[PDB]
Amino acid sequence: IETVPVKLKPGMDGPKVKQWPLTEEKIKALVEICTEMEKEGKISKIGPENPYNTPVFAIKKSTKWRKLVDFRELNKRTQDFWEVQLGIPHPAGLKKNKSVTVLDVGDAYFSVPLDEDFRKYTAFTIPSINNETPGIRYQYNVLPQGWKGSPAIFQSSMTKILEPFRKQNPDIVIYQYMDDLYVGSDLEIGQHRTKIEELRQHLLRWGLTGYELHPDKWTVQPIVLPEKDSWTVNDIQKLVGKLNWASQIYPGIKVRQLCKLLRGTKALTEVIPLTEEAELELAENREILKEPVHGVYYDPSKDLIAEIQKQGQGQWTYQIYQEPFKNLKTGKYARHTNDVKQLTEAVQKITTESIVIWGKTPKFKLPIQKETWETWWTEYWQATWIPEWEFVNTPPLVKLWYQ
Amino acid sequence: PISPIETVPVKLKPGMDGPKVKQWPLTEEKIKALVEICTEMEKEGKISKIGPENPYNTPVFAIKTKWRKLVDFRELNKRTQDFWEVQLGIPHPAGLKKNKSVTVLDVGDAYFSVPLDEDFRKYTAFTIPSINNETPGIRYQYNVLPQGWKGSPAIFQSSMTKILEPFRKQNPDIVIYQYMDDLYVGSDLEIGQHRTKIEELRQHLLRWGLTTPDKKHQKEPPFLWMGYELHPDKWTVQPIVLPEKDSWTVNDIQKLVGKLNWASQIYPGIKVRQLCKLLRGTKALTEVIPLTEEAELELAENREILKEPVHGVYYDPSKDLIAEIQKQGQGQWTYQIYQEPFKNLKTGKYARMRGAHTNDVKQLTEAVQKITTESIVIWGKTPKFKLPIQKETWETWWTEYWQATWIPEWEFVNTPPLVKLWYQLEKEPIVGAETFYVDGAANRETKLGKAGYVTNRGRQKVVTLTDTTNQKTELQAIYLALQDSGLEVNIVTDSQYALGIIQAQPDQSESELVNQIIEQLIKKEKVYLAWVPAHKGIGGNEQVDKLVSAGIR
Ligand SMILES: Cc1ccn(Cc2[nH]nc3ncccc23)c(=O)c1Oc1cc(Cl)cc(C#N)c1
Numbered sequence: 009i010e011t012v013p014v015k016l017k018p019g020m021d022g023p024k025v026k027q028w029p030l031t032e033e034k035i036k037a038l039v040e041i042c043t044e045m046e047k048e049g050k051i052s053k054i055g056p057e058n059p060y061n062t063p064v065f066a067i068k069k070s071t072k073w074r075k076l077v078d079f080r081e082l083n084k085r086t087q088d089f090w091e092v093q094l095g096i097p098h099p100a101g102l103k104k105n106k107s108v109t110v111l112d113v114g115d116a117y118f119s120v121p122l123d124e125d126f127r128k129y130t131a132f133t134i135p136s137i138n139n140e141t142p143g144i145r146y147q148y149n150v151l152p153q154g155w156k157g158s159p160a161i162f163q164s165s166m167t168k169i170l171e172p173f174r175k176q177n178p179d180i181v182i183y184q185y186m187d188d189l190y191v192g193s194d195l196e197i198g199q200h201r202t203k204i205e206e207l208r209q210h211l212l213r214w215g216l217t218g219y220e221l222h223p224d225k226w227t228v229q230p231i232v233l234p235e236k237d238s239w240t241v242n243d244i245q246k247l248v249g250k251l252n253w254a255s256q257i258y259p260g261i262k263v264r265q266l267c268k269l270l271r272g273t274k275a276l277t278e279v280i281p282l283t284e285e286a287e288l289e290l291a292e293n294r295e296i297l298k299e300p301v302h303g304v305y306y307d308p309s310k311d312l313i314a315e316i317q318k319q320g321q322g323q324w325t326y327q328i329y330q331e332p333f334k335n336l337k338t339g340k341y342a343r344h345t346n347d348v349k350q351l352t353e354a355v356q357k358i359t360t361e362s363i364v365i366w367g368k369t370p371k372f373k374l375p376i377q378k379e380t381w382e383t384w385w386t387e388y389w390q391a392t393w394i395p396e397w398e399f400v401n402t403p404p405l406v407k408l409w410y411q
Numbered sequence: 412p413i414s415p416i417e418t419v420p421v422k423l424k425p426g427m428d429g430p431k432v433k434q435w436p437l438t439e440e441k442i443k444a445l446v447e448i449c450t451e452m453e454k455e456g457k458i459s460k461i462g463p464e465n466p467y468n469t470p471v472f473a474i475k476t477k478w479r480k481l482v483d484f485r486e487l488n489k490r491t492q493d494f495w496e497v498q499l500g501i502p503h504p505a506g507l508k509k510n511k512s513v514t515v516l517d518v519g520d521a522y523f524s525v526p527l528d529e530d531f532r533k534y535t536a537f538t539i540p541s542i543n544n545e546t547p548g549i550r551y552q553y554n555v556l557p558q559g560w561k562g563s564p565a566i567f568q569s570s571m572t573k574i575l576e577p578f579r580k581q582n583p584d585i586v587i588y589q590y591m592d593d594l595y596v597g598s599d600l601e602i603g604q605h606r607t608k609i610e611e612l613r614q615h616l617l618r619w620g621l622t623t624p625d626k627k628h629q630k631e632p633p634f635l636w637m638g639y640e641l642h643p644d645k646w647t648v649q650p651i652v653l654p655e656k657d658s659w660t661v662n663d664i665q666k667l668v669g670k671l672n673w674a675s676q677i678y679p680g681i682k683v684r685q686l687c688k689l690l691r692g693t694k695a696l697t698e699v700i701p702l703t704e705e706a707e708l709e710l711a712e713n714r715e716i717l718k719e720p721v722h723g724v725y726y727d728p729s730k731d732l733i734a735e736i737q738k739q740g741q742g743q744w745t746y747q748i749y750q751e752p753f754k755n756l757k758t759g760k761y762a763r764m765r766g767a768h769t770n771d772v773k774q775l776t777e778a779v780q781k782i783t784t785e786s787i788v789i790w791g792k793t794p795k796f797k798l799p800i801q802k803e804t805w806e807t808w809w810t811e812y813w814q815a816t817w818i819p820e821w822e823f824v825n826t827p828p829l830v831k832l833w834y835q836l837e838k839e840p841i842v843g844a845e846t847f848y849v850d851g852a853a854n855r856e857t858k859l860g861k862a863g864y865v866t867n868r869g870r871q872k873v874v875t876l877t878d879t880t881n882q883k884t885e886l887q888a889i890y891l892a893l894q895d896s897g898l899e900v901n902i903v904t905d906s907q908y909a910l911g912i913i914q915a916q917p918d919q920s921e922s923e924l925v926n927q928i929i930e931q932l933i934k935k936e937k938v939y940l941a942w943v944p945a946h947k948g949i950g951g952n953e954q955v956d957k958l959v960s961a962g963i964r
Pocket residue numbers: 502503504507508509510511512513514515586587588595596597632633634635636641642643644725
């Protein structure tokens with residue numbers, strides 16, 4: 009099979025990312041996996057003349073250990089190839105479907121050889137305990153799982169594999185994002201589940217051997233205003249602040265009447281009777297809050313940002329935007345689950361939604377300690393992709409403004 | 412011997428050519444020494460004579476009783492490609508399993524025992540100049556890995572890996588530690604089967620041009636390796652001698668700290684905070700630093716720890732690791748790792764400052780992360796923790812904190828001082844407590860400011876400050892209200908900065924203003940802190956704003 013030449017972006021070159029320490033069990037799982045891939049010719053041992061490195065981890069999903077290569081740096085360094093040169097158009101219909109099934113299709117890539125002059129950039133190391141031995145180093149001879157260039161090259165083969173199925177089912181949306189297929193329909197749940205089984209058989213004939221979303225049922229988490237009888241000084245202070253903030257993002261928010269009620273140096277606990285003008289503006293603000301943001305639109309040339317807040321008792325809120333308050337989507341996540349397990353689950357849910365909606369993973373702003381997250385994320389991770397992340401300190405007031 | 416192993420294909424950096432650096436005319440005595448060295452090396456196969464068609468050159472030098480040849484590979488090293496970073500981490504003794512028999516095999520003339528890619532040999536060209544540089548020089552190039560060259564450590568290690576591979580596949584119950592040009596071989600076999608398996612190893616290595624010491628030349632325990640002592644059933648750091656001196660210079664304290672830091676991996680309780688504090692202040696090496704009372708006390712406690720020797724035990728993979736942490740004092744933490752009660756594998760300390768304002772609960776979790784990581788490196792597994800924190804203290808903190816926080820498997824251990832939260836903030840406003848509306852304002856030009864409050868019960872105050880910031884004035888305002896209030900307080904601020912600091916329950920700060928605030932918060936019975944936006948005509952906020960703005964803004 010003839011390889012497609014991968015032309016790395018000018019100036020900068022390959023990734024030189026450190027391998028993070030791995031537990032004994034994960035190391036062993038990786039050595040067994042890699043021995044096999046080496047025998048099957050998928051990967052081959054490398055010399056020290058290869059200065060490149062990308063991290064490797066071991067996840068589950070399953071009782072089976074699976075290898076996960078972090079190609080985040082390689083992907084950034086090949087952006088011209090997979091996004092502009094080659095490029096998978098994202099269907100706007102996918103988010104409108106009653107059902108979206110997610111299919112792991114990454115096993116396809118190993119039947120397609122990688123350009124001989126690009127293999128060096130796919131280098132990774134299996135580390136050892138207490139640095140007994142230098143790490144086991146390998147590079148790929150086939151399209152690697154996790155590299156954005158893989159579905160880009162495999163596009164043509166994927167189109168052929170899918171042509172009959174698509175022709176027979178013209179109202180089924182099939183989208184390929186990295187190692188997965190997103191299959192959407194407006195069929196009855198039983199019929200949808202039947203059509204995906206049919207598609208698996210088509211996949212099965214080429215080699216390639218689910219996860220069920222409901223996008224039409226995806227609703228916003230509006231900024232909620234308290235619905236109460238007796239309003240305290242604190243309560244309205246809390247309201248004006250919540251409302252003063254929403255007025256930056258939402259067009260048409262009014263506060264003058266509510267603000268007007270707070271006159272003089274009063275005690276926080278003092279119950280102050282409401283006016284039937286202030287009651288009208290909160291009713292109008294409520295009405296704006298339940299609706300989408302006016303004037304906020306997706307720009308394909310700009311990165312997506314996701315911010316998460318720990319709300320306590322297994323609940324988490326999140327927002328997706330490109331401009332710091334001009335937010336495209338806001339939602340929530342609910343849970344023996346611990347904080348890292350919960351945050352891992354939430355980052356993955358938000359990411360699947362971003363893929364469905366925009367065809368782009370967001371850049372996360374995680375309210376955790378880098379090191380905690382670095383040691384722990386792999387224990388609960390189950391996706392075949394990894395999004396980008398930053399470590400932040402949730403501003404105290406952002407949390408309460410979102411429930 | 413020069414290994415018959417396959418060569419590593421070395422390349423120069425993209426868009427770069429080899430070095431072409433002129434040889435400087437040397438003394439007759441230097442030229443003579445180089446000629447002797449080089450002819451010997453040439454007979455050995457290490458270097459070969461070249462024609463004058465090769466245009467590359469690296470300078471040579473002879474230093475002195477014997478003469479050593481020194482090749483300056485600075486230019487070639489700048490043109491040679493980047494290599495894979497050798498081994499990122501070194502073996503820790505505590506991660507070593509206790510083996511029945513262990514032998515150390517150093518490889519003799521390591522670099523010289525491994526060939527250099529034929530296509531790269533041209534770039535190692537050097538010239539022995541003729542007397543007064545009249546006649547053309549004697550030109551040579553390397554056939555083996557040259558000392559001082561960029562690729563040598565990587566290419567050697569990689570060749571040694573390739574060679575050991577078949578032996579590793581057929582002898583899985585034999586540990587081989589690969590460190591630099593040494594091999595550390597351990598087995599759980601009786602003397603005889605190990606002395607045999609080592610000869611088989613020594614022999615397998617000879618088939619590959621690699622020479623190692625024989626039984627009479629092989630080192631005997633205890634091994635003095637990398638500042639450690641490796642004994643048959645224990646390990647320790649080599650002798651630490653704390654210098655006694657009248658006057659301590661910057662260099663003396665620097666060396667002391669290093670020695671103590673090194674000793675900290677086995678000797679529990681080592682403290683270095685007061686010694687470190689002396690080092691901040693740009694003073695010169697030779698400059699004498701008088702010790703503080705506290706540094707003297709810290710040194711004394713350390714001399715006591717070091718008095719009698721301590722050792723660490725090796726690793727048993729069939730057993731779990733227990734890690735115990737103790738609060739040593741301010742910002743200082745000490746830990747011990749063991750499998751069998753009080754027979755430590757290793758010890759250590761944590762004494763960091765993550766931010767400007769923190770608490771013991773945050774510090775404890777930071778030390779648990781540091782220990783966890785360290786365990787993965789050394790043993791490939793996390794330890795079980797024994798922490799001086801009550802489960803109730805932990806769940807109260809985790810539950811109410813904004814950050815995702817997590818300690819893996821733990822148990823409380825009643826080892827004082829215990830970890831606690833020194834104060835708690837109210838969730839709802841207090842009935843029958845005075846409501847202080849606090850504000851601060853600082854003129855950015857004059858650097859002057861005012862801080863004050865207006866209460867719901869008619870009170871008022873305003874203090875002038877001279878070398879301030881808005882952040883400092885807003886914190887002063889909080890302090891003011893905490894000082895002039897009762898034992899129950901409702902405080903309303905427009906500063907998210909201040910709100911943020913206080914909501915985090917700090918018990919220690921770099922800021923004295925924050926430590927003064929903490930002292931007040933602990934004293935108090937109930938405190939409720941609320942926030943309002945600034946400059947919007949909100950209640951008592953507009954009133955403090957005008958009060959503090961007078962003259963300021
Ligand atoms: C391969 C090996 C295994 C266990 N022990 C720990 C041990 N088990 N049994 C022993 N018997 C005698 C002495 C130590 C012993 C060792 O020391 C050892 O050799 C080394 C490892 C390192 Cl990092 C540096 C040096 C060096 N130089 C030697």
